[PDB]
Design a protein around this motif. Structure first.
Motif, PDB file in Angstrom:
ATOM      1  N   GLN A   1      16.194  11.186  -2.566  1.00 55.03           N
ATOM      2  CA  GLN A   1      15.851   8.955  -2.830  1.00 55.03           C
ATOM      3  C   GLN A   1      14.684   8.858  -4.602  1.00 55.03           C
TER       4      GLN A   1
ATOM      5  N   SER B   1      12.718  11.397 -13.408  1.00 57.78           N
ATOM      6  CA  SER B   1      12.451  10.426 -13.614  1.00 57.78           C
ATOM      7  C   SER B   1      11.291  10.177 -13.371  1.00 57.78           C
TER       8      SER B   1
ATOM      9  N   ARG C   1      12.801   6.272  -7.756  1.00 59.69           N
ATOM     10  CA  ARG C   1      12.474   5.303  -7.226  1.00 59.69           C
ATOM     11  C   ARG C   1      14.126   3.797  -7.244  1.00 59.69           C
ATOM     12  N   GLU C   2      15.557   4.616  -7.493  1.00 59.90           N
ATOM     13  CA  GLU C   2      17.205   3.768  -7.957  1.00 59.90           C
ATOM     14  C   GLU C   2      17.010   4.159  -6.214  1.00 59.90           C
ATOM     15  N   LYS C   3      16.077   5.384  -5.169  1.00 56.57           N
ATOM     16  CA  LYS C   3      16.828   5.570  -4.299  1.00 56.57           C
ATOM     17  C   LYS C   3      18.184   6.422  -4.420  1.00 56.57           C
ATOM     18  N   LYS C   4      18.577   7.250  -5.350  1.00 60.33           N
ATOM     19  CA  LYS C   4      19.146   8.227  -5.827  1.00 60.33           C
ATOM     20  C   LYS C   4      18.724   9.538  -5.381  1.00 60.33           C
TER      21      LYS C   4
END
Ligand SMILES: [Zn+2]
Ligand SMILES: [Zn+2]
Ligand SMILES: [Zn+2]
Ligand SMILES: [Zn+2]
Lengths: 7, 112
Positions: free
Chosen positions: B17, B39, B19-22
């Motif tokens: 995860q 990122s 910040r985009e939870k990716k």
């Protein structure tokens, strides 16, 4: 440019 | 190298995860183990790939790749936009009269 004290 | 800390210092996320939870693999400091998502570190894809191939140091551990002085916390250094190595202003080749506005590339990346 990037520096330690501006990062 | 220090055992990596398996979370990003900036967003707290693991490799699952950002910040985009990716999912995004972490970069880890060889000296203290602190980690960040590329990122979250704001590294370009090209810088990310290079740093993953190197013994990377975080902002707090970074020492000058020319003089390797332990230095003081108050010292400043430029960070290379191709490899993220640090250099004191006085240790850059070619010498700089001022900080560049844009990208700065070290003498290891581009010998000259
Ligand atoms: Zn993160
Ligand atoms: Zn570190
Ligand atoms: Zn130096
Ligand atoms: Zn470089």
């Amino acid at each position: 440019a990037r520096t330690k004290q501006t990062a | 190298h220090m055992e990596p800390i398996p979370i990003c210092s900036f967003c707290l996320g693991t490799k699952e995860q950002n910040r985009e939870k990716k999912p995004e693999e972490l970069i880890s400091c060889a000296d203290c183990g602190n980690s960040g998502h590329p990122s979250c570190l704001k590294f370009s894809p090209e810088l990310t790939v290079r740093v993953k191939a190197l013994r990377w140091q975080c902002i707090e551990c970074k020492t000058c790749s020319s003089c390797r002085d332990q230095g003081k916390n108050a010292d400043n250094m430029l960070f290379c936009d191709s490899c993220d190595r640090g250099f004191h202003m006085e240790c850059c080749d070619p010498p700089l009269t001022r900080m560049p506005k844009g990208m700065w590339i070290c003498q290891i990346c581009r010998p000259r």
